[PDB]
Amino acid sequence: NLDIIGKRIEKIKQEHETSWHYDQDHPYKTWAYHGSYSSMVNGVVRLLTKPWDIIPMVTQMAMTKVDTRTQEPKEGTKKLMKITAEWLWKELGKKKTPRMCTREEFTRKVRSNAALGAIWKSAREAVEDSGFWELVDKERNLHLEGKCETCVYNMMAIWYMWLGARFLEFEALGFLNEDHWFSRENSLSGVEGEGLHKLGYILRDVSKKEGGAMYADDTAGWDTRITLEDLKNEEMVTNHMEGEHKKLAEAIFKLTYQNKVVRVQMDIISRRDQRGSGQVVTYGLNTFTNMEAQLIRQMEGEGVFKSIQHLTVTEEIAVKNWLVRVGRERLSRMAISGDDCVVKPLDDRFASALTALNDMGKVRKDIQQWEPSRGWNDWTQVPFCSHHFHELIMKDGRVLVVPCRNQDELIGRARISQGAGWSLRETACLGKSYAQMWSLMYFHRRDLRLAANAICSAVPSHWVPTSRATHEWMTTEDMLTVWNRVWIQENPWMEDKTPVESWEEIPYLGKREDQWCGSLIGLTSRATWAKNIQTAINQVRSLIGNEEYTDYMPSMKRFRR
Numbered sequence: 001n002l003d004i005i006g007k008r009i010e011k012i013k014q015e016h017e018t019s020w021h022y023d024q025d026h027p028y029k030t031w032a033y034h035g036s037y038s039s040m041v042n043g044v045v046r047l048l049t050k051p052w053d054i055i056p057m058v059t060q061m062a063m064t065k066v067d068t069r070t071q072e073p074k075e076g077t078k079k080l081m082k083i084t085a086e087w088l089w090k091e092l093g094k095k096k097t098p099r100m101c102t103r104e105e106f107t108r109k110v111r112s113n114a115a116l117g118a119i120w121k122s123a124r125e126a127v128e129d130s131g132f133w134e135l136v137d138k139e140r141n142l143h144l145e146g147k148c149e150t151c152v153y154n155m156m157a158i159w160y161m162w163l164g165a166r167f168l169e170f171e172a173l174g175f176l177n178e179d180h181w182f183s184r185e186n187s188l189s190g191v192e193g194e195g196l197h198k199l200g201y202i203l204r205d206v207s208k209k210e211g212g213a214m215y216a217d218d219t220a221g222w223d224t225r226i227t228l229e230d231l232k233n234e235e236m237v238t239n240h241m242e243g244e245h246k247k248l249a250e251a252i253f254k255l256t257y258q259n260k261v262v263r264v265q266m267d268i269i270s271r272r273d274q275r276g277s278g279q280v281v282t283y284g285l286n287t288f289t290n291m292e293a294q295l296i297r298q299m300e301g302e303g304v305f306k307s308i309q310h311l312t313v314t315e316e317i318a319v320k321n322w323l324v325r326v327g328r329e330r331l332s333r334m335a336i337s338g339d340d341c342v343v344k345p346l347d348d349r350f351a352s353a354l355t356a357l358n359d360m361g362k363v364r365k366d367i368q369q370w371e372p373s374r375g376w377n378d379w380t381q382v383p384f385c386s387h388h389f390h391e392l393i394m395k396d397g398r399v400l401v402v403p404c405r406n407q408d409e410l411i412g413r414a415r416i417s418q419g420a421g422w423s424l425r426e427t428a429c430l431g432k433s434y435a436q437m438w439s440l441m442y443f444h445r446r447d448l449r450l451a452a453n454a455i456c457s458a459v460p461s462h463w464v465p466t467s468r469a470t471h472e473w474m475t476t477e478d479m480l481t482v483w484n485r486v487w488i489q490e491n492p493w494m495e496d497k498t499p500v501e502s503w504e505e506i507p508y509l510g511k512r513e514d515q516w517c518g519s520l521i522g523l524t525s526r527a528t529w530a531k532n533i534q535t536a537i538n539q540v541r542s543l544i545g546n547e548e549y550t551d552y553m554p555s556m557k558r559f560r561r
């Protein structure tokens with residue numbers, strides 16, 4: 001307990017000796033208590049989406065369990081998790097080599113803008129000061145000694161550490177993301193590096209497997225369900241390491257993941273369970289443990305073991321043998337993105353195979369603990385990564401599988417910014433990012449293709465999209481050329497590589513399907529907005545001023561004379 005959280009706690013107390021009031025009013029039960037001491041609106045996107053100013057599902061988006069425990073899993077459950085985790089690390093390691101990430105790599109990220117959950121004023125000034133690395137060196141040396149001093153989270157939830165602890169985290173465990181351990185190639189169930197023009201093709205491929213319904217059960221507060229046993233299983237990645245890397249990774253797991261200390265608005269508490277690490281490391285270890293949990297739920301449905309109370313020698317061999325024999329074909333019946341999964345099991349016994357799942361603490365959201373899962377019969381209805389997927393046939397017979405979600409959510413998100421000090425140019429460039437994403441991913445939604453064309457017409461041609469998966473819309477290349485590259489040239493599911501010559505070759509959903517997914521097509525106003533769009537474009541041009549603009553609206557047949 002305190003042999004590991006004490007040094008950090010003592011340090012924080014000393015720096016705060018005056019107000020070290022041990023308040024007996026602290027609202028903590030599970031969180032150990034040691035002591036105490038807004039969405040802005042994007043004006044460019046809003047002026048070009050006037051019909052949505054009277055839709056509450058859009059306009060409301062811009063307005064306005066950490067404290068729980070998880071019963072220890074049973075001996076049968078613990079054995080199932082340990083055998084499965086050992087096997088899974090070995091599979092993920094067959095074609096990969098664990099390795100330290102470098103300051104030279106850490107800075108590069110910082111030179112660009114990749115959320116580092118950090119807390120000089122810019123992180124760009126820390127890595128350049130050789131003073132920062134000296135502090136990193138001290139903690140780094142302490143980690144090698146099996147001790148920590150300055151690796152403490154500030155819950156905001158979202159837990160932000162100091163850069164020194166982040167860099168360190170990244171040095172020891174960044175290889176999982178940087179070298180693509182959770183790629184569909186390295187993991188089979190994984191979709192790291194995929195993006196939205198891929199995810200539907202991947203679900204359609206899972207649908208091709210003989211088996212039962214497609215299951216997509218959510219976990220309530222997945223991170224708050226992460227147990228110390230799960231952490232012991234994740235930590236086994238270090239069995240694959242050597243030298244300094246092994247000791248540095250072992251210290252991240254022991255000192256920062258399995259024996260945490262955090263600050264809260266300031267109470268100084270510690271928990272030895274739950275997920276509380278870096279968002280990128282969190283994503284990879286959530287994928288790992290979700291893959292493990294779903295293989296075990298598959299084993300339960302298949303009758304590989306009879307009970308979670310304890311495993312018989314024979315069953316331990318049967319589970320291990322199931323993995324070696326069918327483990328890979330099985331991970332393949334899954335699409336897993338951190339806590340999000342889709343599973344096509346061998347048959348529907350999976351639906352009521354719930355004892356391992358509930359005993360691991362991964363209780364399903366929106367269904368009685370022991371009510372058997374609802375199955376999806378059509379891959380085009382299955383929810384994944386906040387989307388569903390349509391099969392869309394081009395006038396020339398070729399097949400697109402496209403991402404989709406309710407259009408009010410897409411419009412409402414593009415109308416929001418986070419943070420202060422945005423110029424009109426930067427606000428315009430963020431509007432252009434959304435517009436290009438819509439042109440590439442949601443071109444099949446009539447309102448989004450029109451609104452994208454309008455925003456790109458209203459923002460100077462040469463201004464670069466900005467924002468503080470393959471984000472191919474973050475470019476000043478022509479959007480038809482990018483569309484061709486993503487959907488035709490580089491699309492492994494498209495055999496005919498004939499380029500598309502114009503946007504009018506690129507289809508929409510059916511008119512009724514577009515309405516079902518939130519389109520305003522057929523409202524009197526949606527017609528006033530499409531008819532008068534050059535007036536809205538001109539309003540925004542007049543605000544931005546005398547700049548080089550391009551008219552993209554005649555790419556659409558209706559504005560093409």
Ligand SMILES: CC(=O)Nc1ccc(-c2csc(N)n2)cc1
Pocket residue numbers: 511512515521522
């Ligand atoms: C822009 C455009 O194509 N206008 C339009 C007109 C009517 C309809 C319609 C009638 S009954 C139904 N379900 N949908 C859809 C769209």
Ligand SMILES: [Cl-]
Pocket residue numbers: 375376377378381
């Ligand atoms: Cl269905």
Ligand SMILES: [Zn+2]
Pocket residue numbers: 388390404405517
């Ligand atoms: Zn849809």
